[PDB]
XYZ file of C-alpha atoms in Angstrom:
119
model
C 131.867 159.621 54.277
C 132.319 156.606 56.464
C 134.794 154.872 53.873
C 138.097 154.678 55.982
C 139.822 156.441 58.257
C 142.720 157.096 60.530
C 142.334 156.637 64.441
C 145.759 155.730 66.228
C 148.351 156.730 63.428
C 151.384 156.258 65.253
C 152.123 155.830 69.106
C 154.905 154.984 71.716
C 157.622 156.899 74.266
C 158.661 160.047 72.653
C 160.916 162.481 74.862
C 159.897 166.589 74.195
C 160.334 169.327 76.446
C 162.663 172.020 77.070
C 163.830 174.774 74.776
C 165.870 177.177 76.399
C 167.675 175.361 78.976
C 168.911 172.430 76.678
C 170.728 170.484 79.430
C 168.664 167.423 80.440
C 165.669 166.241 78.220
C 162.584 163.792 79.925
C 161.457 160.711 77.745
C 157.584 160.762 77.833
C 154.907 158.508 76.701
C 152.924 160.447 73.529
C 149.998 159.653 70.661
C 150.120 160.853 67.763
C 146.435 161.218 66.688
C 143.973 161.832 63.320
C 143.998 165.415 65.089
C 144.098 164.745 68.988
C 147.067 163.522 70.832
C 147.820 162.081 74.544
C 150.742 163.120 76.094
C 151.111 161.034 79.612
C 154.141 159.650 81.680
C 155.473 160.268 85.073
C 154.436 162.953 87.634
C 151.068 164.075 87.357
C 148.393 166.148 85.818
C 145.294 167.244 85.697
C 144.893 166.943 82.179
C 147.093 165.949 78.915
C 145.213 166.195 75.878
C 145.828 168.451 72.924
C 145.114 168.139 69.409
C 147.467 169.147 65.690
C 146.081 172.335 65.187
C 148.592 174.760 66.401
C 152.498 173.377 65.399
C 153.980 176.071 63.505
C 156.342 173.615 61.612
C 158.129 170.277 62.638
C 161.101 169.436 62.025
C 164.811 167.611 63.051
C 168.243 169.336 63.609
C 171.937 167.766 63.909
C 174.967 167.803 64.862
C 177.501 167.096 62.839
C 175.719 163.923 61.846
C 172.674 163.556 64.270
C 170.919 166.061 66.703
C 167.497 165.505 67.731
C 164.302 166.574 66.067
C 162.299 169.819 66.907
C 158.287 170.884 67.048
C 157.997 174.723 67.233
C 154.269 175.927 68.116
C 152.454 178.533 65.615
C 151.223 179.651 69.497
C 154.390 180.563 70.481
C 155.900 178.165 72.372
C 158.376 175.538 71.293
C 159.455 172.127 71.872
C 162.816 170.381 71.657
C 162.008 166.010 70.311
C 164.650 163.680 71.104
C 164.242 160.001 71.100
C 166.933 156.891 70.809
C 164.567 155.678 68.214
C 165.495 156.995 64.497
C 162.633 155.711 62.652
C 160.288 156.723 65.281
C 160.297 160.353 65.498
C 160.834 160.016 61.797
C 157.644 158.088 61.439
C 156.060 160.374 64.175
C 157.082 163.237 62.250
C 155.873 162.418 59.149
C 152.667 161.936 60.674
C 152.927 164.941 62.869
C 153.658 166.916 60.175
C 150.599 166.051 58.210
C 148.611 166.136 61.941
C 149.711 169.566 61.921
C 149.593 170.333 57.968
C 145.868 168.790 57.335
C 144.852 170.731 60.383
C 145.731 173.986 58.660
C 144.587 173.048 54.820
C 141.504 171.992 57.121
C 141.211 175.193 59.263
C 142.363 177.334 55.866
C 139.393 178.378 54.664
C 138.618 180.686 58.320
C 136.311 183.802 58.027
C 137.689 186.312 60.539
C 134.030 187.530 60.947
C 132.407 187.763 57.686
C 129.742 185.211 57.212
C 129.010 186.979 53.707
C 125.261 185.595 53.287
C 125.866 185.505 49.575
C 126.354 188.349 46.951
């Protein structure tokens, strides 16, 4: 109630893409936002937004020591992170996963047609 908030939580280059052809990632520049997020870098698009209200579940593998970190889609698609940063993703993570977490505690309570007025 207009107390503090939480605009630009964590941003930077952040390298996602691929999933099933794992042989050469592309480092990209992302925002992680209070619910949006701004995904830009080379080539070209028509439009880059998307918000934290989808991600099935974030998270980092390895590889004996160190892989890269992942972001798998409650949509169905899937997303492999990877960035020379270790703290970064980490950070972006932890704020990702909340992006993604709040987003569901916030979009929990979802009537699939019901309204109920009262009884």
């Amino acid at each position: 109630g207009s107390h503090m908030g939480k605009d630009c939580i964590m941003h930077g280059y952040m390298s996602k893409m691929g999933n099933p052809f794992l042989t050469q990632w592309q480092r990209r520049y992302f925002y992680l936002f209070p619910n949006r997020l701004e995904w830009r870098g080379e080539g070209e698009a028509p439009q880059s937004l998307l918000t934290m209200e989808e991600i099935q579940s974030v998270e980092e593998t390895q590889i004996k020591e160190r892989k890269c970190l992942l972001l798998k889609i409650r949509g169905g698609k899937q997303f492999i992170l990877q960035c020379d940063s270790d703290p970064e993703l980490v950070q972006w993570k932890k704020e990702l996963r909340d992006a993604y977490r709040e987003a569901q505690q916030l979009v929990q309570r979802v009537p699939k047609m019901k309204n109920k007025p009262r009884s």
